[PDB]
Write a protein that binds this DNA or RNA. Structure first.
Ligand SMILES: Nc1ccn([C@H]2C[C@H](O[P@](O)(=S)OC[C@H]3O[C@@H](n4cnc5c(N)ncnc54)C[C@@H]3O)[C@@H](CO[P@@](O)(=S)O[C@H]3C[C@H](n4ccc(N)nc4=O)O[C@@H]3CO[P@@](O)(=S)O[C@H]3C[C@H](n4cnc5c(N)ncnc54)O[C@@H]3CO[P@@](O)(=S)O[C@H]3C[C@H](n4ccc(N)nc4=O)O[C@@H]3CO[P@@](O)(=S)O[C@H]3C[C@H](n4cnc5c(=O)[nH]c(N)nc54)O[C@@H]3COP(=O)(O)S)O2)c(=O)n1
Ligand SMILES: [Mg+2]
Ligand SMILES: [Mg+2]
Ligand SMILES: [Mg+2]
Ligand SMILES: [Mg+2]
Ligand SMILES: [Mg+2]
Ligand SMILES: [Mg+2]
Ligand SMILES: [Mg+2]
Ligand SMILES: [Mg+2]
Length: 738
RNA sequence: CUUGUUGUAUAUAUUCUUUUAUAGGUAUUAAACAACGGAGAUGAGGUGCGCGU
DNA sequence: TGTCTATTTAGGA
DNA sequence: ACGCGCACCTCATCTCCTAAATAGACA
């Protein structure tokens, strides 16, 4: 098992940004040639050239000339079948003997073995291996009719296999049976999928073969692996260099060969690598060959690698607890009732309801909901609705937000005074995160506004469309990303996001240490894999209100409605400029609806910026060294299942059978579930059941392996709403909703 | 070399910043508590803006 | 010439 | 809604982190 330590170089090093730009340009040229000749040259055609020009009897020329690899194209060098070193040597010596990457040496005259062969070429090769060893095809979706040609139905069956992972016979039984029991089902699409199931059960192997062949065919238009302009780093592999402790110091000295002689590079010390620590022995004894020089914030850092052991424990299943991630009332809700049993735990919802100034502003419903929440072990009182009052000055929650903030900051002051440091850090990070997200939202909105201003100012004119050959030249030559205005906004956004990430890590560390210290052996979590939810909140933009909805040519007095759009028309959302002959010329966003668009952007961005799916990763990282292991469970029907029956709710539609009811019929409001409990305290007990129950543990979660770094003790087996719905019915965990 | 990175002060000034305003930048003041496998690339998504329908 | 650094090679049949 | 082009960000996934022998260069 490997690891990294990053060091800060102390004095001056000859490795500047030119030494790295040269490395990047060489990478780009080599990868350019590799992609341009991915299919045009066969392996034997290169091995023969090496044999004739050099006359060497070696395995890397004696493998490309064998009949197994003789006529296959270049890209088979990166496939997992070909020997790694033989392919590296064959490709490198063909490239070298032909001088195809335009190499003229490096400025520091580092040994070509370390700068070129085991340097940027060894990275080009690995980047083309990851591209090729996992190769896919891009298929555009297309609406079909009943009388559709077999090829289009054949192609759209390929499209569906990619997007829904339907490769067995049963994976089409489940997906059909999951979108068909929907109450008032959509007949437009179910027929399409029933038709596409016919092709799969008729032309299965043909489908797979055509998938693979199309994936190879599209590779001709592949642009190649490109090293980004913002990378500012360089990797060298050197077999013989030494790292020694700087005498009478906590730092280190790096001796590497430059220009056929040793150059001393002095490094600072790391508290990870301290004199009396086994970590220093492990680093010094067994440091690896790869050396990374990376420039970050105008500071040179050198990364090494070494071998260290892992002692991650194994799951015990004696004391478990679930955890759900929300955004409206609390960031993390656990499956534990707050009974003053967690040492070092501070309940902020108990605290906030002890103040009469806070409960006064709450309605009789809100009071009851907050008191419901306060009886549960909870964390990080994120308030999505209250927080947006900071940006929206004319909001209905502005006064409640101020009271909340004042009480939280006062608790912060008190905890600081009383020397309860962990709770103080937790409270301060909650407070900082709440404002940092608002800062991020303001900065990103400014980015959007500035980009619109710049794009409108430049005034692009296109001769035609559908191809970059027709689009205006200045779009690629002068992007907004290169403007000085954009760069500072992006840097401020980076700073804000860095603060956000640190605060989230502090909160998660607090939670993990609380549960570890109180005897909990496992923490269960949803296997969250995506946080880029579609922005379902729609307020049609100005252009879409004149070029798509055709509201431009309508009469001002008598407007042709389009379903819900008339509701927007009635409300003061758009200040439609009228025309002389009772028509509409131009549309303007009224401020009342502009605030609604802002709220849509705010909530949409909160999902991503707070790393909704990455909470499990932080818990896993803390579990690498801790005493509590993290179990990942399926993230379907945990906020829809009863937590005492342990059953999903199925109703009957018309003269139908048991069908899955709508999610809004089990969660009447976001804070409650039909069985009474909180909609999150309900989910947290669903998450706990999958790992608490021995029988359910095997069905939904992978078997316990040997411990591994950054890998949960348990992980999910099957993925997708349809897959979970079937396994629920086999143990008959289903109840009839009235 | 009481040594790297990140987070944590509603601390002191500020004719600084609504392009971080319960926060930052600009200089000062203090204490620790934590976490720390890095780099590159590929792919899938979402979202912003422009141009056409 | 001796020591030090840089370059070549690594297989399965 | 769609297409198209320019960018930003979040997630999953993969590669890779060796070692010996010999050739060349300089003192
Ligand atoms: N719904 C709704 C609600 C609400 N809303 C609204 C409200 C408000 O309003 P305003 O704007 S302010 O006002 C104005 C106007 O409007 C109107 N209205 C009202 N209301 C309404 C409605 N409802 N509708 C319409 N309209 C309306 C009137 C007036 O005048 C807004 C907002 O605001 P605020 O601030 S308050 O906010 C809030 C709300 C929100 N939400 C909610 C929900 C939803 N859905 N959505 C939304 O938005 O939020 C907030 C709060 O927070 P929270 O805590 S609740 O959070 C949560 C949720 C979220 N989400 C989800 N989803 C989504 C989307 N789509 N988008 C976005 N977001 C979201 O997130 C979080 C999480 O939690 P949970 O626990 S639930 O978890 C979950 C998640 C996950 N998933 C999902 C999905 C997907 N795709 N993915 C994923 O991952 O999972 C988990 C679990 O679940 P469950 O258990 S239920 O299960 C289920 C699901 C699954 N699936 C599916 N698919 C899939 C995939 O692919 N994958 C996976 N893995 N999975 C999955 O499965 C199962 C089944 O399914 P089905 O059934 O088939 S679908 O607005 C609205 O609008 N809406
Ligand atoms: Mg959840
Ligand atoms: Mg910061
Ligand atoms: Mg995962
Ligand atoms: Mg919940
Ligand atoms: Mg630092
Ligand atoms: Mg520091
Ligand atoms: Mg101040
Ligand atoms: Mg502001």
């Amino acid at each position: 098992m490997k690891k990294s330590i990053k060091f800060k170089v102390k004095g001056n090093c000859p490795i500047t940004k030119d030494v790295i730009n040269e490395y990047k340009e060489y990478y780009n040229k080599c990868s350019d040639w590799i992609k341009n000749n991915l299919t045009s040259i066969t392996i034997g055609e290169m091995a023969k050239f090496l044999q004739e020009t050099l006359g060497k009897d070696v395995a890397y020329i004696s493998m490309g000339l064998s009949d197994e690899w003789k006529d296959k194209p270049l890209y088979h060098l990166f496939t997992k079948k070909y020997h790694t070193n033989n392919a590296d040597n064959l490709l490198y010596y063909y490239i070298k003997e032909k001088n195809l990457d335009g190499y003229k040496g490096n400025t520091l005259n580092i040994g070509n073995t370390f700068f070129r062969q085991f340097g940027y070429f060894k990275l080009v090769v690995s980047n083309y291996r990851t591209k090729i060893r996992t190769l896919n095809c891009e298929i555009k979706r297309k609406k079909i009719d009943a009388d559709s040609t077999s090829e289009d139905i054949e192609m759209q069956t390929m499209y569906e296999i990619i997007k829904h992972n339907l490769n067995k016979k049963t994976d089409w039984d489940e997906f059909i049976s999951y979108i068909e029991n929907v109450e008032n089902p959509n007949i437009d699409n179910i027929n399409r999928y029933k038709l596409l199931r016919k092709c799969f059960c008729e032309n299965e192997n043909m489908i797979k073969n055509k998938l693979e062949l199309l994936s190879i065919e599209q590779l001709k238009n592949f642009g190649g692996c490109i090293m980004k302009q913002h990378i500012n780093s360089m990797t060298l592999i050197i077999q013989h260099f030494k790292i020694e402790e700087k005498e009478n110091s906590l730092g280190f000295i790096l001796n590497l060969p430059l220009n056929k002689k040793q150059y001393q590079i002095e490094l600072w010390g790391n508290r990870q690598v301290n004199k009396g620590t086994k970590e220093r022995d492990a680093f010094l004894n067994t440091y690896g060959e790869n050396i990374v020089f990376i420039i970050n914030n105008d500071e040179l850092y050198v990364v090494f690698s070494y071998e260290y052991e892992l002692e991650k424990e194994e799951a015990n299943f004696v004391k478990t607890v679930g955890l759900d991630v929300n955004f409206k009332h609390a960031f993390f809700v656990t499956s534990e009732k707050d009974n003053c049993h967690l040492d070092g735990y501070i309940n902020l919802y108990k605290y906030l309801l002890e103040h009469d100034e806070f409960t006064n502003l709450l309605t009789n419903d809100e009071k009851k909901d907050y008191e419901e929440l306060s009886k549960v072990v909870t964390f990080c009182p994120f308030e999505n609705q209250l927080l947006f009052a900071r940006y929206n000055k004319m909001s209905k929650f502005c006064k409640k937000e101020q009271v909340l903030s004042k009480l939280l900051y006062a608790l912060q002051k008190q905890l600081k005074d009383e020397n309860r440091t962990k709770e103080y850090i937790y409270v301060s990070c909650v407070n900082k995160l709440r404002a940092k997200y608002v800062s991020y939202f303001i900065l990103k909105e400014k980015y959007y506004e500035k980009q619109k201003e710049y794009d409108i100012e430049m005034g692009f004119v296109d001769d035609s469309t559908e191809s970059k050959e027709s689009m205006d030249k200045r779009r690629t030559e002068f992007p907004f990303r290169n403007t000085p205005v954009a760069n500072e906004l992006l840097s401020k956004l980076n700073n804000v996001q860095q603060d956000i990430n640190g605060c989230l890590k502090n909160i998660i560390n607090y939670i993990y240490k609380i549960f570890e210290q109180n005897g909990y052996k496992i923490v269960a979590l949803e296997n969250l894999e995506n946080s880029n939810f579609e922005k379902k909140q729609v307020l049609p933009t100005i252009k879409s209100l004149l070029k798509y909805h055709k509201l431009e040519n309508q009469n001002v007095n008598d407007i042709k409605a389009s379903d819900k759009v008339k509701e927007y028309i009635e409300n003061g959302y758009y200040e439609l400029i009228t025309n002389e002959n009772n028509e509409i010329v131009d549309a303007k966003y009224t401020e009342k609806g502009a605030m609604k668009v802002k709220n849509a952007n705010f909530f949409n961005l909160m999902m991503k910026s707070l790393h909704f799916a990455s909470v499990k990763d932080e818990f896993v990282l803390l579990s690498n060294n801790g005493k509590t292991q993290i179990a990942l469970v399926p993230s379907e029907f945990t906020s829809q299942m009863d937590s005492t029956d342990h059953c999903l709710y199925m109703k009957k539609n018309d003269k139908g059978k048991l069908v899955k009811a709508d999610k809004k019929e089990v969660r009447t409001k976001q804070e409650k579930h039909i069985n009474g409990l909180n909609a999150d305290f309900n989910a947290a007990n669903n998450i706990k059941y999958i790992v608490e129950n021995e029988v359910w543990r095997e069905i939904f979660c992978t078997r316990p392996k040997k411990a591994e770094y950054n890998v949960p003790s348990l992980d999910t087996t099957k993925k997708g709403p349809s897959a979970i719905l079937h396994m629920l019915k086999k143990i008959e965990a289903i109840k009839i909703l009235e």
